[PDB]
Amino acid sequence: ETLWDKLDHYYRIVKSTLLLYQSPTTGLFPTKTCGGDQKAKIQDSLYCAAGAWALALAYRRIDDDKGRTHELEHSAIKCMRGILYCYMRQADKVQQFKQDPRPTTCLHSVFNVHTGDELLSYEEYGHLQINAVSLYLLYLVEMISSGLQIIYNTDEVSFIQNLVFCVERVYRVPDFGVWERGSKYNNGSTELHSSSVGLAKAALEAINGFNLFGNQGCSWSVIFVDLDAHNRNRQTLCSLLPRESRSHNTDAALLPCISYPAFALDDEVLFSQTLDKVVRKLKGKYGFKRFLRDGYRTSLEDPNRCYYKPAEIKLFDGIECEFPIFFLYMMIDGVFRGNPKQVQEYQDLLTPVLHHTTEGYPVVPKYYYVPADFVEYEKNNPGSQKRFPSNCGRDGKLFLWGQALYIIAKLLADELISPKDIDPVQRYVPLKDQRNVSMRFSNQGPLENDLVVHVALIAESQRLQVFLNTYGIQTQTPQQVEPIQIWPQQELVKAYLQLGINEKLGLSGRPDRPIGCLGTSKIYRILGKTVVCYPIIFDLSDFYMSQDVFLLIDDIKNALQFIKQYWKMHGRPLFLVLIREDNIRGSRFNPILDMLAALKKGIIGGVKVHVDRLQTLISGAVVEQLDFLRISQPDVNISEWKDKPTHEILQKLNDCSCLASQAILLGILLKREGPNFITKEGTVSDHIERVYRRAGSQKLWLAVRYGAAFTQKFSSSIAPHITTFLVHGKQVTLGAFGHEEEVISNPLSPRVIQNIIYYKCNTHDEREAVIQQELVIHIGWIISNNPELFSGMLKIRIGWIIHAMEYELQIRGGDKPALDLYQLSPSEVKQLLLDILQPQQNGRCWLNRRQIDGSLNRTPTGFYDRVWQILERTPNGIIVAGKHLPQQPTLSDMTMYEMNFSLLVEDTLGNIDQPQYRQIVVELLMVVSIVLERNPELEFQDKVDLDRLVKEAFNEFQKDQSRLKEIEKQDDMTSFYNTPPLGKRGTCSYLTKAVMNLLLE
Amino acid sequence: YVPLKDQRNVSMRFSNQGPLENDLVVHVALIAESQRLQVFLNTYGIQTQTPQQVEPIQIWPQQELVKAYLQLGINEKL
Amino acid sequence: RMKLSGRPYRHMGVLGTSKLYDIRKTIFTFTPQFIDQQQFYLALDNKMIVEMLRTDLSYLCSRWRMTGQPTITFPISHSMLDEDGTSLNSSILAALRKMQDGYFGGARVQTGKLSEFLTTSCCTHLSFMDPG
């Protein structure tokens, strides 16, 4: 038999299965093949189109095809055009989502097939899904690279650009998931999904630098990408890769993202570990289940409650459905990886489960279900019983997506095509070719990092230049580089904003967002003039820590490390550094010489750098082109001066020279009169700005902080810190110690956070805003560069840490009065924070160490699992601080490693007022866990009162102290706190004695 | 150097149909010479087109191409 | 699927029946409509048949905007004989003799056998009649 018979048989299969139910009006397939359903998804139609394209590509190899390929290309083009028309029909939603993303402004994903219009309201389906858009973009670029034509005019280019802009920010907004359910509880909450992030990253890589018009194109078919969004997506994927979600340990949806559709996991060892874990934990006789405890269309499921009630998931286990479609994906992975044995084993496994039509055509049923007479018997013996085929397995109902995957897998197995043909973009490469690819691996190899970064030195003034030259320092004035121009960061942002504007539909272009260091590291050409920019660290900032040279040394070193680690473009990056005459300021001129001499040496902390004339570096280098533009102590107290008249306050302000009194008088005037009042030096706002700038120049820190609080200025980097803290798994709470506090569990817009923190600041204190900002930036920087330092802490509270270093500084002061923290330099504040953050050692009083540990809310490693095992072996429960933790709901709702059980435990334990008491309670709980685990014969007879145990231990310690040191009964347990837990007579001994006393009775 | 599996769409060495295959289809263009001959052929069912009806296209003998190629590759300095 | 009933039934003229047809690798020929006796009695008169035949011949010779020579089949039925049924009518034999010698009505007529006309005649290939 020749190829003709096989291709004809595949043609009959496709005609009788796939293309039979295509809608001529729109060209998109529906979800149901019977009953005249008017609903359609996006995934199934796209998969069918991809299968048709693959079949046409296979059939192309015959010069006498008799037009078979033409029909399939035309059907695929019609489907793509219909989907593009449906997407572009809704235009207001895209613009709304570009500014304030939300489920209300989300793009609709389900619509009627007959007229391409919406049919069902967004309150019953969510409509929030970004995987479909990314997959559509990837398939579209793949088809265009293949040689097909789908884009007609330039408006489609603008629409694609806006779609890329909207999808660039998918790493923060939670999605509804592939299965549309999201959380396992199915209550109506959105969470982050790793598969969506991976698909978005893959599409971002694919769409970068590609001609959308095909064979011909000059300047109106290219797409521009931002490296910062790709970097952030990569970080989020890497952080959230081991676990698909916080509420899902594993899921079968992780397969089409680390396989042929995506091919995004380039880690080998971790990819293999994840594959083994998924195979071990989700393997089934009849296929692969969606996930554990999945009550999806099971026998016990009823069509009367969209949201599952609590504790129903516990009853829903053991009857999970089986989906044999994943066998095709596994076989595709096997043939792609060149492992025939896996292909044979999965083919033999899939052979019996396959069904046949009247003519014997293969059938792939959707899901498998168990009859109601084996509900309980199956629980005792998993998989020993037999299931029953679904409705779409005999006649009248089919599964287009499953059949398309089956025919694709069979075509791949039959060797009718090659992996290169199906992957014209080369998404997957083997280990020996990962040497000179773009955006993925460097030219030095995967397991190598020796990048050399170019550094350019530019002076600021002629006097500063000659002063540096007198010491041997070579710098060039900006007036001697006349052919080259140096622009700030705002110009590039404005130029990017001018791009992507359309008048027919109404387009706002790229949103006004700051550009990262990697973006500024390149060289641009605007209107035929070369444009270079320096990082945002060098520009003047109203804040105060920019005047400390140690902070500048640290941040330039961190920027150099960031450039070294995350640079993959061809060509060496360009770095620009500027030195200002006001920086040296006399005595502060030596360490600048030190850093610059180290830079001239060639190595900066293990990072190699190069210095030369800027013109030499510019010549012979690739320059980015932007061609769109042409086409288009105080003596004044608050209480004393509050009731003074306006004229007296004005006179006092006029005739006073002290900065603090001037600031407090300006604040009183602003609070009483208002910002629009006129004083001797212009408007109130202008006077406040002038005095703030003068304070910054004089660098007296308390007045600068007061003026910054007055100006209501906030840093533009809090959102990355809060989002990386959330993705890490920790929690942050904003507030003041001893006052109200706000807890954040999901990413929020900057406006809401700013309003909340400013309202709190207006409520309690004056300068806590800037102190909190400095603390959060320092903590974020430290956790970014030293993640292991913050191990053991879950809830990060700035106010408690502030109280912590205040107490430590007061202790250090001793007889000398404690120094005010508002007057501390940024270097001193950073040193204090790093000192308190240290794991702590002996020498100092153990009470202070316990206080610091409790303030930081540190928890021992393995505390959560120990608590869970205690709760499993505690028939009654655990009661602390008046809170109750019943065993039945937590056992019937949560699981071993679920994070919400840990959250409930933390909420229960957070009612303790004394942090040292909390630490002692935690140590006692650990001792109880260890003792109970070491011996299973002894079990508790009733609920334990840990307060009673602590009181008994305290009384025993009091008796022992009276016996030894003849000390009378003293109130408070601070003596117990001072005693170390281990030693000759530690706290652990008393806790063990209390434990044995409780167990014996 | 090309492996055996890759030699499928290489120019000037192998055909698209594969190394061990030869099923090329060749196009032929049929053009008449005179109107009388064209109508005589059409009377018997044979369809031919006169050279005067292909005005956008041109038909030239083999000597013109030889002359044009001879024009190429002339240098005056050497 | 699209609720289409195809071409509605309609009468066929001489221009459609003149050409040859191909149905599943076979040669088919259709007689002209005006020799139909199960519709009306207009075909029961010999002189009527003669004049309609002459008019159809003239009309076919007039335009013929197709390619190839036309072909007409004129079988002789039992009703074309005399009362005794032993000889054809005078009008019929006169019509055939006028068809011979290449001049009848207002057109040139050439007679022969279907074997020779096969090599030079318009042929139509029908593909929609093939099995699905």
From Swiss-Prot, chain B:
Subcellular location: Cell membrane
Record's comment on post-translational modification: Although the final Cys may be farnesylated, the terminal tripeptide is probably not removed, and the C-terminus is not methylated.
Domain of life: Eukaryota
Clinical disorder: Glycogen storage disease 9B: A metabolic disorder characterized by hepatomegaly, only slightly elevated transaminases and plasma lipids, clinical improvement with increasing age, and remarkably no clinical muscle involvement. Biochemical observations suggest that this mild phenotype is caused by an incomplete holoenzyme that lacks the beta subunit, but that may possess residual activity.
Description of how the protein assembles with itself and partners: Hexadecamer of 4 heterotetramers, each composed of alpha, beta, gamma, and delta subunits. Alpha (PHKA1 or PHKA2) and beta (PHKB) are regulatory subunits, gamma (PHKG1 or PHKG2) is the catalytic subunit, and delta is calmodulin.
Family membership: Belongs to the phosphorylase b kinase regulatory chain family.
Annotated function: Phosphorylase b kinase catalyzes the phosphorylation of serine in certain substrates, including troponin I. The beta chain acts as a regulatory unit and modulates the activity of the holoenzyme in response to phosphorylation.
Name of the protein in its database record: Phosphorylase b kinase regulatory subunit beta
Native species: Homo sapiens (Human)
Gene name in the database record: PHKB
Part of the intact protein present: 470 to 547 of 1093
Swiss-Prot record, chain C:
Highest taxon, organism lineage: Eukaryota
Protein name per Swiss-Prot or TrEMBL: Phosphorylase b kinase regulatory subunit alpha, skeletal muscle isoform
Residue ranges of the TM segments: none
Post-translational modification: Although the final Cys may be farnesylated, the terminal tripeptide is probably not removed, and the C-terminus is not methylated.
Role according to the record: Phosphorylase b kinase catalyzes the phosphorylation of serine in certain substrates, including troponin I. The alpha chain may bind calmodulin.
Tissue expression per record: Muscle specific. Isoform 1 is predominant in vastus lateralis muscle. Isoform 2 predominates slightly in heart, and it predominates clearly in the other tissues tested.
Residue stretches in coiled coil: none
Portion of the parent chain present: 491 to 622 of 1223
UniProt family annotation: Belongs to the phosphorylase b kinase regulatory chain family.
